[PDB]
Write an enzyme that holds these catalytic residues in place. Structure first.
Site, PDB file in Angstrom:
ATOM      1  N   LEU A 135       5.353  -1.350   9.763  1.00  0.00           N
ATOM      2  CA  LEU A 135       5.674  -0.700   8.500  1.00  0.00           C
ATOM      3  C   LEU A 135       4.463  -0.216   7.718  1.00  0.00           C
ATOM      4  CD1 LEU A 135       8.449  -3.085   7.167  1.00  0.00           C
ATOM      5  CD2 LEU A 135       8.763  -0.890   8.356  1.00  0.00           C
ATOM      6  N   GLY A 143      -2.388  -2.459   4.615  1.00  0.00           N
ATOM      7  CA  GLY A 143      -3.076  -2.370   3.337  1.00  0.00           C
ATOM      8  C   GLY A 143      -4.576  -2.480   3.504  1.00  0.00           C
ATOM      9  N   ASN A 144      -5.225  -3.120   2.531  1.00  0.00           N
ATOM     10  CA  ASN A 144      -6.649  -3.408   2.664  1.00  0.00           C
ATOM     11  C   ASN A 144      -6.866  -4.663   3.499  1.00  0.00           C
ATOM     12  OD1 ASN A 144      -7.345  -1.213   0.975  1.00  0.00           O
ATOM     13  ND2 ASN A 144      -7.116  -2.483  -0.863  1.00  0.00           N
ATOM     14  N   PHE A 145      -6.138  -5.731   3.176  1.00  0.00           N
ATOM     15  CA  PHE A 145      -6.297  -7.008   3.846  1.00  0.00           C
ATOM     16  C   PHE A 145      -5.096  -7.406   4.693  1.00  0.00           C
ATOM     17  CE2 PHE A 145      -8.898  -7.906  -0.141  1.00  0.00           C
ATOM     18  CZ  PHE A 145     -10.087  -7.561   0.469  1.00  0.00           C
ATOM     19  N   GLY A 146      -3.996  -6.639   4.665  1.00  0.00           N
ATOM     20  CA  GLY A 146      -2.759  -7.068   5.284  1.00  0.00           C
ATOM     21  C   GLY A 146      -2.082  -5.974   6.095  1.00  0.00           C
ATOM     22  N   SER A 147      -1.064  -6.399   6.838  1.00  0.00           N
ATOM     23  CA  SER A 147      -0.263  -5.539   7.692  1.00  0.00           C
ATOM     24  C   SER A 147       1.169  -6.035   7.576  1.00  0.00           C
ATOM     25  CB  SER A 147      -0.736  -5.665   9.136  1.00  0.00           C
ATOM     26  OG  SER A 147       0.076  -4.902  10.002  1.00  0.00           O
ATOM     27  N   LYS A 187       4.705  -9.986   6.288  1.00  0.00           N
ATOM     28  CA  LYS A 187       3.344  -9.620   5.921  1.00  0.00           C
ATOM     29  C   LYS A 187       2.360 -10.565   6.596  1.00  0.00           C
ATOM     30  CE  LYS A 187       0.231  -8.595   2.090  1.00  0.00           C
ATOM     31  NZ  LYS A 187       0.146  -8.275   0.646  1.00  0.00           N
ATOM     32  N   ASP A 225      -2.101  -3.918  -9.641  1.00  0.00           N
ATOM     33  CA  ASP A 225      -2.046  -2.833  -8.671  1.00  0.00           C
ATOM     34  C   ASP A 225      -0.727  -2.088  -8.784  1.00  0.00           C
ATOM     35  OD1 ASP A 225      -2.955  -1.124  -6.715  1.00  0.00           O
ATOM     36  OD2 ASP A 225      -2.788  -2.595  -5.083  1.00  0.00           O
TER      37      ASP A 225
HETATM   38  N1  LIG Z   1      -1.069  -5.483   3.202  1.00  0.00           N
HETATM   39  C1  LIG Z   1      -0.644  -4.934   2.302  1.00  0.00           C
HETATM   40  C2  LIG Z   1      -0.083  -4.174   1.092  1.00  0.00           C
HETATM   41  N2  LIG Z   1       1.356  -4.285   1.145  1.00  0.00           N
HETATM   42  C3  LIG Z   1       2.069  -3.494   2.108  1.00  0.00           C
HETATM   43  O1  LIG Z   1       1.512  -2.748   2.845  1.00  0.00           O
HETATM   44  C4  LIG Z   1       3.570  -3.669   2.157  1.00  0.00           C
HETATM   45  C5  LIG Z   1       4.212  -4.637   1.390  1.00  0.00           C
HETATM   46  C6  LIG Z   1       5.590  -4.786   1.477  1.00  0.00           C
HETATM   47  C7  LIG Z   1       6.280  -4.003   2.381  1.00  0.00           C
HETATM   48  C8  LIG Z   1       7.792  -4.075   2.519  1.00  0.00           C
HETATM   49  C9  LIG Z   1       8.586  -5.108   2.131  1.00  0.00           C
HETATM   50  C10 LIG Z   1       9.938  -5.014   2.284  1.00  0.00           C
HETATM   51  N3  LIG Z   1      10.463  -3.923   2.817  1.00  0.00           N
HETATM   52  C11 LIG Z   1       9.636  -2.933   3.208  1.00  0.00           C
HETATM   53  N4  LIG Z   1      10.236  -1.777   3.808  1.00  0.00           N
HETATM   54  C12 LIG Z   1       9.560  -0.616   4.315  1.00  0.00           C
HETATM   55  C13 LIG Z   1      10.403   0.314   4.887  1.00  0.00           C
HETATM   56  C14 LIG Z   1       9.884   1.490   5.387  1.00  0.00           C
HETATM   57  C15 LIG Z   1       8.521   1.708   5.325  1.00  0.00           C
HETATM   58  N5  LIG Z   1       7.939   2.943   5.811  1.00  0.00           N
HETATM   59  C16 LIG Z   1       8.896   3.916   6.212  1.00  0.00           C
HETATM   60  C17 LIG Z   1       8.210   5.243   6.525  1.00  0.00           C
HETATM   61  O2  LIG Z   1       7.154   5.078   7.467  1.00  0.00           O
HETATM   62  C18 LIG Z   1       6.198   4.120   7.024  1.00  0.00           C
HETATM   63  C19 LIG Z   1       6.838   2.774   6.700  1.00  0.00           C
HETATM   64  C20 LIG Z   1       7.684   0.780   4.734  1.00  0.00           C
HETATM   65  C21 LIG Z   1       8.194  -0.396   4.230  1.00  0.00           C
HETATM   66  N6  LIG Z   1       8.313  -3.021   3.065  1.00  0.00           N
HETATM   67  C22 LIG Z   1       5.628  -3.034   3.126  1.00  0.00           C
HETATM   68  C23 LIG Z   1       4.264  -2.881   3.037  1.00  0.00           C
END
Ligand SMILES: N#CCNC(=O)c1ccc(-c2ccnc(Nc3ccc(N4CCOCC4)cc3)n2)cc1
Length: 300
Positions: free
Chosen positions: A23, A26-30, A50, A144
């Site tokens: 999905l 980030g800077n420190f996470g995936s 995460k 942030d």
């Molecule tokens: N390390 C760091 C910083 N935080 C994140 O990257 C982060 C945090 C929470 C979530 C999160 C939590 C719950 N649901 C979702 N859903 C989500 C659905 C679709 C997408 N994108 C859809 C389009 O393509 C890229 C991903 C991203 C997150 N994300 C995703 C990234």
């Protein structure tokens, strides 16, 4: 020592946490999408997971604090904590949360304009403000707030979706002075955060003003806060010169412009959030009420 802090290491067992999709990083996470399928029958709840990008000791300690922060929050406009997975045989930590299907609000605004109008933008604005009211009751400073960190559950619901920079106010102070800065989202920062590393509810309000700007620019190419500030500063500037000019600009009332199509009254909310006088910024409660009154005063 004698008895270690309570944790439920059997709630999300790594052997039943099944990868579905990457999905983002980030800077420190995936973050991944996974399915938790304990009855190994190809079913179970879909969750977001995460993980860290670089698992240094200091990062693990900060990640534990982030996890405790998210676990302490229960609100309609805050991504729901589910648990932790102690993977690698209980020698690693991953944060489990609900999965929100439409991704970040930044991406949704760019990818789903077909289903976005001003009514929806005001609804999202209101929801963000309410989540932030809730954070304030816990004395948490998000640090942030930006559309990239807001997540979209459906066309009618957004939630604050990440807490990696969040700090807890000291008991006896109304600001947190960050004394180990890493990578800083400078184009969302209040002036006193840029000049003194001071973060507060009021600096979150400043950043919320930038979020509101982002919403009404519809994430239009060339209209993002970094692109607009760089145009104002001078696009050729590099390195610390950018920060010097950003500070000087903000201190003397330079501001992001009113987005095309943005009502004057919504731009007024932005500019009131962007007050160099910290105590004169509105509260999140003020903002939620004003936005909901604007919405409610429309016909219908
Ligand atoms: N390390 C760091 C910083 N935080 C994140 O990257 C982060 C945090 C929470 C979530 C999160 C939590 C719950 N649901 C979702 N859903 C989500 C659905 C679709 C997408 N994108 C859809 C389009 O393509 C890229 C991903 C991203 C997150 N994300 C995703 C990234």
């Amino acid at each position: 020592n004698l008895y270690f802090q309570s944790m439920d290491p059997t709630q999300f067992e790594e052997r039943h946490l099944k990868f579905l999709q990457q999905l983002g990083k980030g800077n420190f996470g995936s973050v991944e999408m996974c399915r938790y399928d304990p009855l190994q029958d190809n079913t179970g709840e879909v969750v977001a997971v995460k993980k860290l990008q670089h698992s240094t000791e200091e990062h693990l300690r900060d990640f534990e604090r982030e996890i405790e922060i998210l676990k302490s929050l229960q609100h309609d406009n805050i991504v729901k904590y589910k648990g932790v997975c102690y993977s690698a045989g209980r020698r690693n930590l991953k944060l489990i949360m609900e999965y929100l299907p439409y991704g970040s609000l930044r991406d949704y605004l760019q990818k789903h304009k077909e289903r976005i109008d001003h009514i929806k933008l005001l609804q999202y604005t209101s929801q963000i403000c309410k989540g932030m009211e809730y954070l304030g009751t816990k004395r948490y400073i998000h640090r942030d707030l930006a559309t990239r960190n807001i997540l979209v559950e459906n066309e009618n619901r957004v939630k604050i979706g990440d807490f990696g920079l969040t700090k807890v106010l000291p008991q006896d102070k109304e600001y947190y002075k960050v004394k180990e800065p890493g990578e800083s989202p400078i184009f969302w920062y209040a002036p006193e955060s840029l000049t003194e590393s001071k973060f507060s509810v009021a600096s979150d309000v400043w950043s919320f003003g930038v979020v509101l700007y982002e919403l009404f620019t519809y994430i239009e190419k060339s209209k993002s806060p970094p692109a607009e500030f760089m145009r104002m500063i001078g696009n050729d500037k590099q390195g610390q010169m950018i920060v010097f000019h950003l500070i000087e600009l903000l201190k003397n009332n330079g501001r992001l412009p009113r987005p095309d199509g943005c009502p004057d009254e919504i731009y007024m909310i932005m500019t009131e959030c962007w007050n160099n006088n910290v105590n004169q910024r509105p509260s999140f409660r003020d903002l939620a009420l004003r936005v909901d009154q604007i919405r409610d005063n429309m016909a219908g």
